[PDB]
Amino acid sequence: SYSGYSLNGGVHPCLPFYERMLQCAKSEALPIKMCTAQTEDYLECHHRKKQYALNYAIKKELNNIRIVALPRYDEENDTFVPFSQATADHIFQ
Amino acid sequence: AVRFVGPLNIVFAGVAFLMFYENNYKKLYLNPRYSYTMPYLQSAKITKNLYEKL
Amino acid sequence: QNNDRWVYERRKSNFIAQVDYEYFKFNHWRTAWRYFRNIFLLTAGVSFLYNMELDEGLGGLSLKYKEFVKTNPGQDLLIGNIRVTQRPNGLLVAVDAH
Amino acid sequence: KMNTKSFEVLIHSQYAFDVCREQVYNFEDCRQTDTPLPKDPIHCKAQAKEVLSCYKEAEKMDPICLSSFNDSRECMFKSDGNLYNCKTWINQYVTCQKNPAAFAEFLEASTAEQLKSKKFDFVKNRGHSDKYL
Amino acid sequence: IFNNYFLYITEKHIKILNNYSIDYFFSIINITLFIPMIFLSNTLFTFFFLIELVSCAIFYKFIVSKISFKNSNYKDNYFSIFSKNYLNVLFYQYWSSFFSSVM
Amino acid sequence: VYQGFKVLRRNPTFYNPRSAGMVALSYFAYSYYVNKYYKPQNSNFEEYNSSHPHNHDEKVRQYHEKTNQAIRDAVLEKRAEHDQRLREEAKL
Amino acid sequence: GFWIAPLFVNILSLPLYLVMLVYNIVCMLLITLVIASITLIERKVLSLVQRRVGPHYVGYRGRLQYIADALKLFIKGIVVPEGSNKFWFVAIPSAAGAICYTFWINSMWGPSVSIFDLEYNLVYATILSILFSFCIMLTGYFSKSKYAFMASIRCAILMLNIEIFLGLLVINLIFISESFCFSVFVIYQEIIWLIFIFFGVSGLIFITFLLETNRAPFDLAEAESELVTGYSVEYGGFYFALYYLGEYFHLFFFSMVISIVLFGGWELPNFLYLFLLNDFNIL
Amino acid sequence: LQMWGVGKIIEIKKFMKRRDIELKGLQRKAAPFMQSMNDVRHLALRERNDMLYNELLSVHGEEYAQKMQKRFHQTDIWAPFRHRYAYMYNSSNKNVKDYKQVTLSRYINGFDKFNV
Amino acid sequence: FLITITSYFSNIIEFNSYIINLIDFITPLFFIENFVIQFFILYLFYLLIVNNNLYYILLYIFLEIVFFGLFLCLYQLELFTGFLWVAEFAIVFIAVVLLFYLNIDGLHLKYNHNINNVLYYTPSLVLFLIFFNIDYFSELELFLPLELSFIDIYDDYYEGFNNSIMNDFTPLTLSYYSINSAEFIIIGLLLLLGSVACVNLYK
Amino acid sequence: MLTWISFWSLIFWLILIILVLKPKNFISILFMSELTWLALYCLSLLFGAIYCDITLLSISFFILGVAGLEFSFGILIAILYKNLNESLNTDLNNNNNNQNIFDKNFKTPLEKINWQ
Amino acid sequence: FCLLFVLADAWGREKYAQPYKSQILHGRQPFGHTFVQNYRNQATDLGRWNHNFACYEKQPGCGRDFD
Amino acid sequence: MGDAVVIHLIQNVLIFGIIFWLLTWGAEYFYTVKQQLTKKQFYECGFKSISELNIQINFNFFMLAVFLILYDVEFTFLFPVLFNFSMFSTTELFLAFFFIFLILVSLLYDWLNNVLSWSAE
Ligand SMILES: CCCCCCCCCCCCCCCCCC(=O)OC[C@H](COP(=O)([O-])OCC[N+](C)(C)C)OC(=O)CCCCCCCCCCCCCCCCC
Ligand SMILES: CCCCCCCCCCCCCCCCCC(=O)OC[C@H](COP(=O)([O-])OCC[N+](C)(C)C)OC(=O)CCCCCCCCCCCCCCCCC
Ligand SMILES: CCCCCCCCCCCCCCCCCC(=O)OC[C@H](COP(=O)([O-])OCC[N+](C)(C)C)OC(=O)CCCCCCCCCCCCCCCCC
Ligand SMILES: CCCCCCCCCCCCCCCCCC(=O)OC[C@H](COP(=O)([O-])OCC[N+](C)(C)C)OC(=O)CCCCCCCCCCCCCCCCC
Ligand SMILES: CCCCCCCCCCCCCCCCCC(=O)OC[C@H](COP(=O)([O-])OCC[N+](C)(C)C)OC(=O)CCCCCCCCCCCCCCCCC
Ligand SMILES: CCCCCCCCCCCCCCCCCC(=O)OC[C@H](COP(=O)([O-])OCC[N+](C)(C)C)OC(=O)CCCCCCCCCCCCCCCCC
Ligand SMILES: CCCCCCCCCCCCCCCCCC(=O)OC[C@H](COP(=O)([O-])OCC[N+](C)(C)C)OC(=O)CCCCCCCCCCCCCCCCC
């Protein structure tokens, strides 16, 4: 069964989606066709297929030559500065 | 020149040396180095701040 | 005795002793080393060399643009039929010059 | 974000919780949810930034507080982050921070034993029924 | 209901002749008590555990099968007769249970 | 290892080095085959969400997605209209 | 230097591993000396019980008796029986020695004074004891002496009993501490030693201690009257020295375990002034 | 003796719990600021990843990139992606280090950074 | 420079777009520890295949248990590693005693595995390996840079100070005594009935 | 080289193949069955960690108990082999010729087939 | 005998205040337990959940803050 | 449970045993071993052993191991409730007592049938 607990006794991360899916299934007269959104959200939170597809696409893009240098992160101001600009915290300096 | 080891062995030694040197170089000069990972190369000073390069 | 019948009728041939001149050469281990180095080269060495060359090129382009901005900021760097341009968010991208 | 270490952040927060109370309340209200699962930080980013700015403002201390802050830091170093064991020193730091003018008389009314170097060794002095929690 | 009817017939047969021990019918009692609970299973997990318990009970029943009878054959008093039926039953039941359980 | 030599005399490296090498080579080849060819084929992520998918499975998946979206939109619109009509009739 | 530094990244760390090895060697040598002193103490205590002087002339007043016996065990020559398996005959004592010299890792000498940050100390102790019993059984089997094999079977029976006995003791103990770490017991034992709760089963605790230590009345594996010597009837020299060292290591460390889990560990007996003590101090 | 000792142990446990109440209060006082810092860092990393994903995927099309990034129909629930969920140490990590650091830091000085 | 060399006839972007597929195909992605663990598991399987001595079979089963525990430790399930080891070392001990009782000398059946290996097992295994993969989309480590993953750094301090647990048995108790208590009781009854069956089999 | 999910999914059936492949000696089959149960134990723990499923994590002790009970039954059957006069090597319990065995040879318990 | 004694004592502990009644009859379990146990439980009907304090509205002293 | 320090300590323990190996080898210099007929034969209290490698024992106490296999798991099932007994409720208390009672009844049945003692075979 779906206990709904985490691995430290907390709450399973899928519990909101599972509750929504069960509520929709109970309420709808045609749960299979009318709860597609909730069921897909639950299945996504469970399997993470879409994130794996995104990671696969990102790996292919990284293999392709399009990115040279990402902007540095100024943590003091919580901003992003272009890699071209020189900063004290910069690795190369 | 004359070599007791074969050309393939020479190629293996060269590529292995390149792998070793490139790995160490990227770990030593292209790293934030906020964590003490290479002893005797990063400083062992006492840091008074969250981020201090070692 | 029928349980041990096989051993009774087994025909065992006396050993012939010969001097082994290539025992210490470890030819089987030499063959293992040859196979290992061939596979290692063909896959890992080629992949590492190509990836290292790509990384060196990307780092060189980054440093070249970093130096180029000082001389003239805002101009895209053209090198090797490639255009290196900085997006407004600050992300350098290399695209086809043409 | 702060360039400050964890235990020092805890010590500073023990006082800052009373100066930026409205910001803390705003952040808590923003992050409130109907389930124990955490809320997305993207919604509470603004309140978090406000809280952090107020914390930056509060982290400043008078020089007279330096001795109390240092002894609290030593206590929190010798004990691996146990706030309860070091609350007395943290409480002294909070008192010095709040109305530092009276901390002069606080220190003046000090005994010979109190006017001594404070060394902490919890292995040698475990305490009384310390659960470490 | 079916278990009750079969138990009734078995009682009549036992009154006719007794070649079955009390442990045999204690195992039957356990099987009858625990086997109908399977249809109340709401999850495959509980179904697996219930069927495992029932399988243990059936293995108990097979273990308590009578082996040696007091027949009218007086020719094997001083000779060894080998019968492998008991081991075959136990072996096959045990390994079938193992395969089914793991799968 | 106390008495390391006496302990490692018989089996320094392997008992059947040839078979150990065959095991290693088979494991390497099978991992290569799976990861590079077989699992990617089953995952079918090469043309995922492509605007012009050339794969029948991807086309079917996109058809399912668009059809479900259309069904949800139509039913939501119809339910909104039905609720509005009921509310209007209530105050009469 | 810029282009030479990468070559030494992995070369400058080997001295650190050497230092770690040196520290481990020092700890193992010190614990070996402790066990040797324990053997001398055992001889002297038995001498007191039997009203005799005991070791008195190996070193002035018998101060170096353990050193002498260790050196003699090193010196003694060893021969493997022809019928016995040469590989296993030496492999088993080597594994036993490795396990016995690994025993000391699962020891605490303070609130967190342990070489490693281990939590499942009781699990480690059980596993190490099972491994040592494995080694004893294999020793008895591969030394084809019938007496040694019977000693191995006796060791198996002792292990069977120890499983349930020590498991039940640990089950009762964890019910209070709620952890397998030795430290968590002392915090509860500060006021009263945990042995007071178990005072009724004090006899069973004594039985458990003796059974785990393989001391009388539980010296069945090494019974020298029922069997010639026991599992070591065909082992001499340092091969037998290793088994003796392992037995004494187990004795010492299980004595430590009992002291920590039931007798306050490193807490003084404050229960002797319980009536006069105050539970709070409010100014 | 058994009954009295069990009672005494329960007394000790309840005293520990009494002090745990105050420890929890102090931890609550310190919680909001550390949570804010952690959230800001988490959002900074998310922004970097979003920029990288947009740059990499926008070549095929803005709609394609949006479809790839979108994961949930209903966004009222936050479900971070994880390859696995931590179990040991109350879903925490004891050794936030490399294996080499974990081995060496127990014997060699300089690896620990003295968080005070 | 590769860019300079390519610029004479094409662009580095095009050259990479053409060669990167082959580079990825020939790129080996793995960690040394994972490779070692998996190889030793498979090698122990091979040793089990080729060894008929019961004592060595038991030794290799024990080593397989050790390597399973090592994998669990690497995956950070240390508590389950310890429980597995304590539960199974006793089983191995009892197995050694059983081997002493039956087949003490260690002499085994004279069996030739080559005949069946070439007749049925090698081709059947080849077909099964060719057509068997249940892993749908799981990705290896090193598939993407570790710097892209960020969730593991997230910490929930509110839940942390609201959490009072101190042991790693909380899921186990919530399962055996709260949720799966039905199966817990079924296991208890099963063990009792199994003890009865064992006694009857002894009789 | 292989993801843990695929590795464990494959090695479970590989262990079953080994169990079937090895010569049928009851003790060896019992050891292989124990190994199969432990493979299921590891696989269940892996999936429980992946999916944050306390039920999958808790399946560990259920598997341990079932394996223990089956091992007890196997020990009893192996001991019962003696009283039933059956070789542990089951292949020797029948007269069918087997090329896999070097020295399988059975004769009728007689001394002379022809008397006259 | 000990079980009967403790059960009788537990049923007699109803005289004491709510926090000191027998835990056999009254449940006191962590927030992870209580939330899942009483999420949609109309029998208890505790109400909404306080996220940052990990308790329901109707539980005594759910949100206890300083000052 | 530890970390890689445990494996490194295993390696260190092996290196330590190499020290005893060196001492044992060095000790070889202070004695000579002559070859004699019975010097490398099995010891049987001063007489030749009739049988070697056929040393089968009688495992007539196998029921104890059989029951140990079950009771180890039964005891292992009790650990989580003992660890988290501060969280006990009516259901958990009832289940723990139920399980302990089952263990006691199984032990009582074993005692009644007298399978906890040595038998003729
Ligand atoms: C024992 C201590 C170490 C154990 C752990 C070691 C690390 C983990 C295991 C790694 C695999 C090691 C296997 C070596 C076995 C060698 C056996 C042998 O000598 O066989 C010779 C045999 C026999 O030698 P031969 O044929 O010359 O002599 C025999 C002659 N006849 C046939 C006539 C009898 O050669 C072969 O035919 C088969 C060779 C197979 C070699 C396989 C090498 C490994 C393949 C995988 C490489 C993957 C590389 C990935 C790189 C990634 C980037 C870093
Ligand atoms: C911690 C304890 C330390 C002390 C331990 C004791 C040390 C001293 C004894 C050690 C050896 C044991 C005694 C051997 C006596 C017999 C000598 C003999 O016949 O030869 C021995 C062995 C012979 O092996 P073999 O081929 O005969 O093995 C088969 C054995 N039988 C016949 C039983 C089946 O010599 C060698 O194998 C040497 C060549 C191969 C060495 C191993 C290569 C692969 C693993 C290492 C890889 C290293 C890195 C390079 C690879 C690529 C890396 C990226
Ligand atoms: C923190 C942990 C602390 C504990 C660590 C303890 C580790 C101690 C290690 C000591 C050194 C041991 C030698 C290691 C070096 C390699 C040895 C080697 O050459 O291997 C070849 C041999 C195996 O190959 P082989 O050469 O004997 O024969 C091959 C098989 N045939 C011939 C049939 C083809 O390895 C061993 O067997 C070594 C065993 C050493 C003793 C280990 C005892 C452990 C406890 C019992 C386990 C269960 C046994 C059950 C079955 C009954 C017994 C068989
Ligand atoms: C792990 C090691 C063991 C730990 C055990 C836990 C501690 C228990 C301490 C003792 C508590 C009392 C238990 C019951 C004793 C009953 C004695 C008895 O039978 O008396 C009548 C006996 C004999 O009377 P009897 O009637 O029983 O038998 C005699 C029979 N007739 C009458 C026919 C002659 O009289 C005595 O002599 C009793 C002397 C008792 C002295 C006990 C001293 C024990 C000292 C060692 C204890 C361990 C100390 C550890 C310290 C650790 C510090 C860190
Ligand atoms: C018959 C002969 C009998 C011989 C009996 C000897 C018994 C065994 C004694 C072992 C313990 C000896 C301890 C000596 C002091 C060691 C100090 C040390 O290592 O520094 C740690 C210190 C720890 O300092 P650290 O932790 O601050 O190091 C990190 C430093 N930063 C951060 C800058 C990187 O390590 C170092 O100094 C670094 C270099 C280490 C180089 C390797 C040292 C090996 C020492 C081997 C000693 C062997 C003695 C043999 C004697 C033989 C006599 C015949
Ligand atoms: C020269 C030839 C070399 C040939 C190859 C060498 C083969 C060596 C085989 C044995 C060692 C294997 C090491 C790799 C696996 C490491 C697993 C791991 O990650 O654990 C650390 C992990 C550490 O994980 P962690 O929880 O600290 O998390 C680490 C966090 N990050 C990822 C950020 C670094 O261990 C644990 O978590 C729990 C502690 C486990 C302690 C186990 C103790 C017993 C070990 C007995 C080994 C006996 C081996 C010899 C005898 C048997 C035959 C092999
Ligand atoms: C960190 C602290 C470290 C402390 C370490 C302390 C340990 C010290 C160990 C000392 C060992 C001494 C061994 C002496 C061996 C020679 C004597 C002998 O055995 O005689 C029998 C045989 C000779 O027998 P024989 O035929 O001459 O007979 C002698 C008897 N009489 C006198 C009557 C004739 O040994 C030999 O074969 C001698 C020649 C070969 C050996 C030569 C010396 C080699 C030294 C190797 C040192 C290796 C060091 C490794 C270091 C790293 C370890 C990891």
Ligand SMILES: CCCCCCCCCCCCCCCCCC(=O)OC[C@H](COP(=O)(O)OCCN)OC(=O)CCCCCCCCCCCCCCCCC
């Ligand atoms: C200039 C800039 C740098 C350019 C790149 C340089 C890269 C490094 C060098 C790569 C080449 C290394 C040499 C490879 C030799 C291969 C020889 C061979 O395959 O012959 C079979 C070989 C011989 O058998 P043996 O047992 O040794 O007996 C001797 C019999 N004459 O048998 C063996 O020993 C075993 C052979 C194993 C073969 C494994 C094949 C793996 C193929 C993987 C896919 C590769 C596809 C091509 C990728 C190209 C990408 C650019």
Ligand SMILES: CCCCCCCCCCCCCCCCCC(=O)OC[C@H](COP(=O)(O)OCCN)OC(=O)CCCCCCCCCCCCCCCCC
């Ligand atoms: C502590 C808490 C509680 C837990 C306690 C845990 C107790 C664990 C008990 C372990 C017992 C170990 C001793 C017994 C087994 C010894 C190994 C063995 O028997 O091997 C059998 C099998 C291979 O056998 P075979 O193919 O015949 O060749 C033998 C080569 N060793 O073996 C195999 O399948 C694989 C064997 C691999 C051997 C690897 C040797 C590596 C040597 C490294 C030397 C140092 C350098 C290390 C470098 C590391 C770099 C990362």
Ligand SMILES: CCCCCCCCCCCCCCCC(=O)OC[C@H](COP(=O)(O)O)OC(=O)CCCCCCCCCCCCCCC
């Ligand atoms: C766990 C280790 C520590 C021991 C903890 C448990 C202690 C249990 C005994 C507590 C005191 C009981 C006092 C009874 C007084 C009384 O009625 O006394 C009535 C009579 C008095 O007889 P006398 O005239 O000889 O004094 O005694 C009895 O009836 C004896 C009752 C049995 C006592 C045996 C010891 C306890 C064994 C465990 C309990 C099960 C007993 C079953 C008996 C059939």
